[PDB]
Design an enzyme around this catalytic site. Structure first.
Site, PDB file in Angstrom:
ATOM      1  N   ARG A 115      81.103  62.569  64.383  1.00  7.93           N
ATOM      2  CA  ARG A 115      80.056  61.701  64.901  1.00  7.93           C
ATOM      3  C   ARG A 115      78.953  62.490  65.587  1.00  7.93           C
ATOM      4  NH1 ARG A 115      83.915  56.906  67.405  1.00  7.93           N
ATOM      5  NH2 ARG A 115      85.169  56.665  65.508  1.00  7.93           N
TER       6      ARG A 115
HETATM    7  N1  LIG Z   1      74.909  53.032  59.563  1.00  9.24           N
HETATM    8  C1  LIG Z   1      75.609  54.168  59.608  1.00  9.24           C
HETATM    9  N2  LIG Z   1      75.168  55.225  58.892  1.00  9.24           N
HETATM   10  C2  LIG Z   1      75.868  56.361  58.926  1.00  9.24           C
HETATM   11  N3  LIG Z   1      76.996  56.628  59.583  1.00  9.24           N
HETATM   12  C3  LIG Z   1      77.415  55.564  60.274  1.00  9.24           C
HETATM   13  C4  LIG Z   1      76.801  54.325  60.339  1.00  9.24           C
HETATM   14  N4  LIG Z   1      77.518  53.465  61.156  1.00  9.24           N
HETATM   15  C5  LIG Z   1      78.531  54.192  61.557  1.00  9.24           C
HETATM   16  N5  LIG Z   1      78.537  55.468  61.058  1.00  9.24           N
HETATM   17  C6  LIG Z   1      79.507  56.522  61.322  1.00  9.24           C
HETATM   18  O1  LIG Z   1      80.629  55.903  61.933  1.00  9.24           O
HETATM   19  C7  LIG Z   1      80.685  56.238  63.336  1.00  9.24           C
HETATM   20  C8  LIG Z   1      81.008  54.968  64.074  1.00  9.24           C
HETATM   21  O2  LIG Z   1      80.501  55.096  65.418  1.00  9.24           O
HETATM   22  P1  LIG Z   1      80.696  53.948  66.479  1.00  9.24           P
HETATM   23  O3  LIG Z   1      80.923  54.523  67.819  1.00  9.24           O
HETATM   24  O4  LIG Z   1      79.527  52.973  66.359  1.00  9.24           O
HETATM   25  O5  LIG Z   1      81.977  53.197  65.960  1.00  9.24           O
HETATM   26  P2  LIG Z   1      83.125  52.293  66.588  1.00  9.24           P
HETATM   27  O6  LIG Z   1      84.455  52.953  66.250  1.00  9.24           O
HETATM   28  O7  LIG Z   1      82.995  50.876  66.202  1.00  9.24           O
HETATM   29  O8  LIG Z   1      82.898  52.514  68.128  1.00  9.24           O
HETATM   30  P3  LIG Z   1      83.663  53.096  69.392  1.00  9.24           P
HETATM   31  O9  LIG Z   1      84.460  54.294  69.007  1.00  9.24           O
HETATM   32  O10 LIG Z   1      82.556  53.385  70.409  1.00  9.24           O
HETATM   33  O11 LIG Z   1      84.522  51.932  69.892  1.00  9.24           O
HETATM   34  C9  LIG Z   1      79.261  56.687  63.621  1.00  9.24           C
HETATM   35  O12 LIG Z   1      79.297  57.616  64.694  1.00  9.24           O
HETATM   36  C10 LIG Z   1      78.967  57.494  62.368  1.00  9.24           C
HETATM   37  O13 LIG Z   1      79.898  58.565  62.370  1.00  9.24           O
END
Ligand SMILES: Nc1ncnc2c1ncn2[C@@H]1O[C@H](COP(=O)(O)OP(=O)(O)OP(=O)(O)O)[C@@H](O)[C@H]1O
Ligand SMILES: Nc1ncnc2c1ncn2[C@@H]1O[C@H](COP(=O)(O)OP(=O)(O)OP(=O)(O)O)[C@@H](O)[C@H]1O
Ligand SMILES: [Mg+2]
Ligand SMILES: [Mg+2]
Lengths: 507, 464, 47, 114
Positions: A363
């Protein structure tokens, strides 16, 4: 009655002091007395075993025993150590194997620890950090290309048993020798490999690998093998985190591997169930997420006000049958800044390391990847994500378009390019060139089965003949057009003289 | 007068006071850890009265080094946080203490973090749509201005990316004020959001409160109320339009479960606190918008073990007007924002509100995707080839509808490198109306990935 | 020939589905055992 | 066979055999298709569906469910009805002819109605 209350107060205030064990079993002891003991204080029992005073009840103190709880028995005297749960820390720990209490178990002499550090200190606040800016070159082509790790990042190696996780972590530790030899604290990386619940033979083999590769000049092992009770397996990661934090706050860069946090979760489950705390999901207590997050959250990239140090976390999670949706894997994913899912299906087919693209992601990477490596590897991840869908599609389609066959043949070479042997990390100077070979199609003219050799023999050839490319990548950090033209010239020159296994001409 | 610590069980502290000076519930008590390495002014919050003048309290700072017998003083009032236009542009912890400069806000007006939600007489439903520029949200889960919105998801599906995306869409051009509550999330993401808002110049209009992972359950469950107090001040007193992002609201219930197991309360179904519904409702019934003053709210909800039947998501579903349930299966396809078009819902997707042109298209899309989900079994075993011709056409356009719901989000720029795009609601309606009618069944399916628009769709179709 | 290939693909997909459903069934079985134990020991720990 | 008879037992056991086979073929039918079955299995599936629908009956105390009055099928008539069904004597009638119908005479009436 009130004179009564008053003299009662005299007594309460009256409250070098010794406690006595009144109950003991399975790693939990209860100590009456010690009215002045601090919560999570480190209590000492006569046999040299130590406990952590978790519960401080009105009648007694419930302490989790770290080590040989079989030596504890009713009536034993318990002594305050006067120190909140803490481990000795200092530069003397480099090259030493120490149990979670900092006590050496490698057979060498004592450790001249600089000070002590409490294992339960708060992680850097929101305003004390800064976005990671410099890469942690793992030495693994797949990780450094598709899911880069930046100093101050928490990258979750996750996969089934026997899937190449400890291999990846040991390669990462080994690759830091070129940085260590520089002598510059702003470039050195000091490693701490916390083995939680691993076989003693595995830890011995890891130490052997680190010694052969010279990694024990800067790597500390915190070993809590399967033999040791749940106490050591519980606080070994925190011991590693304290050792690393001492260096992190002194302006030094640290790399902490936790092998495995699934075994620490099990140890904490054991401790909490022996304490009779009602279980939650998968029999875990409600605060296992707190355990792991409190842990990994201390791995941070400190702001320049706090020395600019960093501690990079590489937790290992042993999933069961690729159940990445399980409780502990999902918790650690929600904690960490990326995951490297080492799939077992690829691991059996010789794809080594078995990094599953698509699911695997960094990420916080991209901002922590050198310019040349980002330039060459930009298309690589998408190409492999497409290929690995096209590979399955082709096996059943009668025929495919020439463009689809070209993509298939490019992916079958990219995958072989990312294939890498154990204990052989590649400096980013060689990683960028290796990925350049495949991403730009120079491997198209090479048969698939020989790519691994064609890569290696070329990297050596350049290293012997055209080291200007590697030196330029080191100093400028970008594959300049001049260097790129020189590199393609050398690639063509090598190809002519590169033999194939079948003898075909790769020109 | 002062009390005495009697029992310490992790972050829970029992304190015995004199006969008549027992503190009220939720009162803020102060103790001192004097051990040099980690000495601090511990803050406790009274949670229960156990009799014999004992009161059990939840610690806000970690209870390490604390010694039985230490004097405990009760402030006589609940935990207070600063309020005012001053809190905008600064970073606070669960206790109202500023972080970017610790001397800030101790002279501002202070508000207790515990309050009863607004009276039922002041509530009225919100039925005004909030165009976010995302096709999936604007079509199938139209958000509500002044209403509660939820982004459900497991680990790694994109909740935080969506929250910062909607900060880009909504907050960056918002007329009023914003508040962000980091509850049980990464301090890394908190710092990243801080710098991002500073760079976009949205920082001056937002107050950040952080209760991130490394903090004990007490602050990890009171940080939501701490941020909600500032939001409620900006709502009731200043009359400003308020945004309130909360990432992640499941951590509030998780810390609740931890403190419940520590307090001695018997566990509920899957180990959660028996008062899960009560506490969750107390929190999210203060996030409501009243008649003349709106508080839009967007809450990321973590769904443990990807189990949407977990009691925490199950309870927090009932407190939402728009729900965007992110799903692992969609995420694995690369179809970002990763929304499950079928499991998500909105309370304003009725034709009286969004219009019949919008409603008819949305329902047709949902029908196509539901038929696709029903056929998933045959798709998995045999494949598309063995379906009926009607169902084969339906599946061929269902895949295209599913991919077209993906969008190159602004926040995605840091990952994909591509810049983000915004699709106006009218264009989304027209595009999906055309898709459901079959006007795009000839273009390849990949021409729909992360495309965000009809014109750009034609561009990518030409590209392939 | 196409039928042979399609049936081989269907057999492989069915085997993969069987493996995934067996993993899911084992996870559900373990979850049910843990839930039953949780209820039983919650009742003992109350009594 | 020692109590209910040897014709009752045979008819009941053949009905059970047919229904069990059609519960093992149901998944194949739902996913692969009825055509993909063997001829014997296809004809057995037809018999099984008709047998399932014939085991249904318009009970007297459930006229608030179906509207039509109840019916009693004597045991001997049942065992002959099902002997005929398991042998394909009624394989030509439509499935709906057997639904909520109390006996052979009512079966004929409903078949003529359809
Ligand atoms: N639209 C996108 N385009 C590219 N990569 C994405 C996108 N959405 C998510 N990702 C990838 O997936 C990861 C998901 O991050 P995010 O923190 O929003 O997810 P989450 O697991 O729902 O949240 P958290 O861990 O904070 O509870 C992003 O950091 C990136 O690695
Ligand atoms: N990249 C590699 N190339 C070749 N062999 C490898 C590679 N990585 C690992 N191996 C071999 O695979 C086997 C298991 O590797 P490894 O110790 O990394 O697995 P693991 O996932 O850490 O397992 P464990 O559950 O024992 O910790 C060992 O034989 C190791 O030598
Ligand atoms: Mg290992
Ligand atoms: Mg999040």
């Amino acid at each position: 009655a009130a004179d009564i209350e008053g003299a009662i107060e005299d007594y309460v205030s009256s409250f070098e002091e010794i406690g006595t064990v009144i109950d003991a079993g399975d790693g939990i002891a209860h100590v009456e007395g010690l009215p002045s003991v601090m919560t999570q204080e480190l209590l000492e029992f006569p046999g040299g075993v130590l406990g952590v005073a978790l519960n401080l009840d009105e009648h007694s103190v419930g302490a989790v025993i770290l080590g040989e709880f079989e030596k504890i028995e009713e009536g034993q005297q318990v002594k305050r150590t006067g120190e909140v749960l803490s481990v000795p820390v200092g530069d003397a720990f480099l090259g030493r194997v120490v149990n979670p209490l900092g006590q050496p178990i490698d057979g060498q002499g004592d450790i001249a620890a600089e000070t002590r550090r409490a294992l339960e200190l708060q992680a850097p606040s929101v305003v004390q950090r800064q976005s990671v800016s410099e890469p942690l070159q793992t030495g693994i082509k797949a990780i450094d290309a598709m899911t880069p790790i930046g100093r101050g990042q928490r990258q979750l190696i996750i996969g089934d048993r026997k899937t190449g996780k400890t291999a990846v972590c040991v390669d990462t530790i080994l690759n830091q020798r070129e940085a260590w030899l520089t002598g510059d604290p702003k470039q050195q990386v000091r490693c701490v490999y916390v083995a939680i619940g691993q076989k003693g033979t595995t830890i011995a083999s890891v130490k052997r690998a680190l010694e052969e590769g010279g990694a024990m000049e800067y790597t500390t092992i915190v070993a809590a093998p399967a033999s040791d009770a749940a106490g050591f397996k519980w606080l070994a990661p925190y011991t590693g985190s304290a050792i690393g934090q001492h260096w992190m706050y002194n302006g030094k860069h640290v790399l902490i591997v936790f092998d495995d946090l699934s075994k620490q979760a099990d140890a904490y489950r054991a401790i909490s169930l022996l304490l009779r705390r009602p279980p939650g999901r998968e029999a875990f207590p409600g605060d296992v997420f707190y355990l792991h997050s409190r842990l990994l959250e201390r791995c941070a990239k400190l702001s320049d006000e706090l020395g600019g140090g960093s501690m990079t976390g590489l937790p290992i999670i042993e999933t069961k049958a690729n159940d990445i949706s399980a409780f502990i894997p999902t918790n650690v994913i929600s904690i960490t800044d990326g995951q490297c899912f080492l799939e077992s299906d690829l691991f059996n087919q010789g794809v080594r390391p078995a990094i599953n693209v698509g699911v695997s992601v960094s990420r916080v990477g991209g901002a922590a990847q050198i310019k040349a490596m980002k330039e060459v590897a930009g298309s690589l991840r998408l190409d492999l994500s497409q290929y690995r869908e096209l590979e399955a599609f082709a096996a059943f389609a009668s025929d495919l378009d020439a463009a689809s066959k070209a993509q298939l043949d490019r992916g079958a070479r990219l995958v072989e390019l990312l294939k890498q042997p154990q204990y052989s990390p590649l400096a980013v100077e060689e990683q960028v060139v290796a990925i350049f070979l495949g991403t730009q199609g120079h491997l198209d003219s090479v048969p698939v089965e020989d790519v691994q050799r064609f890569e290696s023999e070329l990297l050596e050839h350049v290293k012997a003949s055209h080291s200007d490319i590697f030196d330029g990548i080191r100093e400028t950090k970008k594959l300049s057009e001049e260097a790129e033209e020189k590199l393609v010239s050398v690639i063509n020159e090598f190809k002519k003289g590169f033999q194939a296994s079948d003898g075909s001409s790769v020109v | 007068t002062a009390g005495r610590v009697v029992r310490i069980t992790g972050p829970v502290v029992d304190v015995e006071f004199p006969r008549g000076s027992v503190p009220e519930l939720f009162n803020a008590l102060h103790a001192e850890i004097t051990f040099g390495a980690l000495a601090k002014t511990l803050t406790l919050e009274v949670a229960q009265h156990l009799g014999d003048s004992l009161v059990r309290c939840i610690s806000m700072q970690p209870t390490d080094g604390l010694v039985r017998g230490v004097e405990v003083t009760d402030t006589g009032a609940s935990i207070s946080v600063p309020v005012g236009d001053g809190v905008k542009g600064h970073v606070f912890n669960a206790l109202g203490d500023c972080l970017d400069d610790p001397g800030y806000g101790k002279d501002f007006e202070h508000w207790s973090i515990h309050r009863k939600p607004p009276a039922f007489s002041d509530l009225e439903p919100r039925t005004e749509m909030l165009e976010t520029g995302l096709k999936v949200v604007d079509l199938l889960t139209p958000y509500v201005r002044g209403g509660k919105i939820a982004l459900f998801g497991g680990a790694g599906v994109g909740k935080t990316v969506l929250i910062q995306e909607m900060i880009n869409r909504i907050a960056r051009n918002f007329g009023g004020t914003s508040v962000f509550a980091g509850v049980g999330e990464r301090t890394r993401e908190g710092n990243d959001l801080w710098v991002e808002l500073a760079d976009a110049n949205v920082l001056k209009d937002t107050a950040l409160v952080f209760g991130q992972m490394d903090e004990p359950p007490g602050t990890r469950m009171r940080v939501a109320l701490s941020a909600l107090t500032m939001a409620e001040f900006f709502r009731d007193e200043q009359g400003q339009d308020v945004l309130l992002f909360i990432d992640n609201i499941f951590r509030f219930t998780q810390a609740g479960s931890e403190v419940s197991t520590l307090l001695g309360r018997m566990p509920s179904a899957v180990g959660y606190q028996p008062t899960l519904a009560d506490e969750m409702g107390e929190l999210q019934e203060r996030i409501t918008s009243t008649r003349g003053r709106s508080i839009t709210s967007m809450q990321a909800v973590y769904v443990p073990a990807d189990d949407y039947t977990d009691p925490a998501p199950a309870t927090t579903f009932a407190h939402l007007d728009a729900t965007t349930e992110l799903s692992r299966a969609v995420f694995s396809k690369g179809i970002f924002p990763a929304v499950d078009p079928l499991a998500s819902s909105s309370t304003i997707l009725d034709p009286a509100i969004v219009g019949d042109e919008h409603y008819r298209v949305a329902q047709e899309v949902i029908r196509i995707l539901q038929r696709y989900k029903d056929l998933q079994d045959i798709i998995a075993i045999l494949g598309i080839d063995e379906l009926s011709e009607e169902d084969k056409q339906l599946v061929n356009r269902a895949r295209r509808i599913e991919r077209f719901l993906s969008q190159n989000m602004m926040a995605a720029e840091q990952f994909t490198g591509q810049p983000g795009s915004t699709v106006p609601l009218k264009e989304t309606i027209e595009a999906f109306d055309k898709l459901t009618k079959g006007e795009f069944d000839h273009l390849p399916e990949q021409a729909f990935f992360l495309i965000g628009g009809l014109d750009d769709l034609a561009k990518k179709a030409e590209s392939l | 020939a196409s039928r042979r290939r399609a049936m081989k693909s269907a057999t492989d997909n069915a085997d993969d589905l069987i493996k995934a459903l067996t993993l899911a069934a084992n996870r559900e079985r373990q979850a049910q055992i843990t839930q039953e134990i949780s209820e039983i020991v919650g009742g003992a720990n109350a009594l």
